[PDB]
Amino acid sequence: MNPIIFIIILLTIMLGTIIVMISSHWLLVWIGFEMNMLAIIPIMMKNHNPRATEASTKYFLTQSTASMLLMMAVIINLMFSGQWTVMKLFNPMASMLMTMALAMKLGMAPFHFWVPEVTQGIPLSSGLILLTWQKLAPMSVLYQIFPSINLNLILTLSVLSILIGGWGGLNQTQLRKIMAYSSIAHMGWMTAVLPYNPTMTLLNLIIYIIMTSTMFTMFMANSTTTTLSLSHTWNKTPIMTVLILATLLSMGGLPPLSGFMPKWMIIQEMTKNNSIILPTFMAITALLNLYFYMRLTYSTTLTMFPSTNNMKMKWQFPLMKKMTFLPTMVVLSTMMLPLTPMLSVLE
């Protein structure tokens, strides 16, 4: 890929997402998703190997199917209201189809099967876009249609995503598959609180993106994609093991780190609405996420794994990776809890 072509394709990924977020018309929302899907596929295939080909194919079939259900909802909505404005839908059947359509786009359970496989099959830089930027457009739509979403449906998807994400990550040694199941688990928190307070869905979304960007950037810095390969980091760059430890404890939601903030504000909103059982169930189930985060911290920072002789050659060379924004992102991922009241900026 020509560097200019890579930039044009990247800007088209962003343009499609932007179109979704600024459109007042369901047709332009659908166009934004289609433009975004068209541009991302070449980023998945960038390395051209059978796993990238399989990943892109599975991604294309899933997203293309979701778009047809998305457009079906729009047309049913048109029949029963005669307008195209992006807002609540005027038919329950349309609401279900659109809700499922966005669930498949996000990879929520039980539409989750593609997320672990696609993430594993593409590079780390492409995986970063998939698990972060690609969440913006579907969430921005849920943010506008939630007054007509079926509560039982959306909370069922949220419950299943948290369970399947937590259980799915327990059996993974591949970092990209660990991030994928973590993303599924975190998607559930965002949608669980959506019926009650959409502002808390944005907060969770933003904090999830910062922490997820931090982790991927650190994996890219060391070109690590497996647990054992990451366990050599203490011998190359000791500092990076401490950042991984702090970031991973944050993604586990442990006070006083930033990742506790969204779990905390979501539990507050749910209890205000007399929802007690669900947040309790969600918080306990999130301990599964903490478990397989803690395994990574053990193999990465809190112990010293065996090294290889050739590792000594790497001592003599500096890190050349760009690691753009990593100093800022890691601080935000960890030291933001004292500023929680700043969440009103999202109101």
């Binding site: 039980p110 509560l151 909370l155 205000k272 609405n273 007399n274 929802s275 007690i276 059982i277 669900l278």
Partner: protein
Amino acid sequence: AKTVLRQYWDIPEGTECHRKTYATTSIGGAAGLVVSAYSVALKTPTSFLEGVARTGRYTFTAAAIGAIFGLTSCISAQVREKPDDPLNYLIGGCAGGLILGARTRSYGIGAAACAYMGLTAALVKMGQLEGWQVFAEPKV
């Protein structure tokens, strides 16, 4: 599911056990079928006959757990003349766990099931009594 759930909660506790056992069996059987469908879809059976065998094995196990809980919980209430006591569902819940343990030929599963199903069922009766909401309607 809403129609079958409503039927169970519309006949008072401890009265008309046969009707209750049909409701819990109907709920159990449906749950077993849902499990069979995903299982057959995601773990392909080697033969059509086996896929049917797996379906019947799960649907029967699920329906048995439903019937025994519905039978035990109603009969315990009628016998004890305590219609609105969460303890009745604890007896029914544990009995279901034993049926699961028997169908699996695993005492340890039977022990754990009798506990966790016992607590979960008793927790449901308290929720009905006190109005605990699982999927709480938005209010504020």
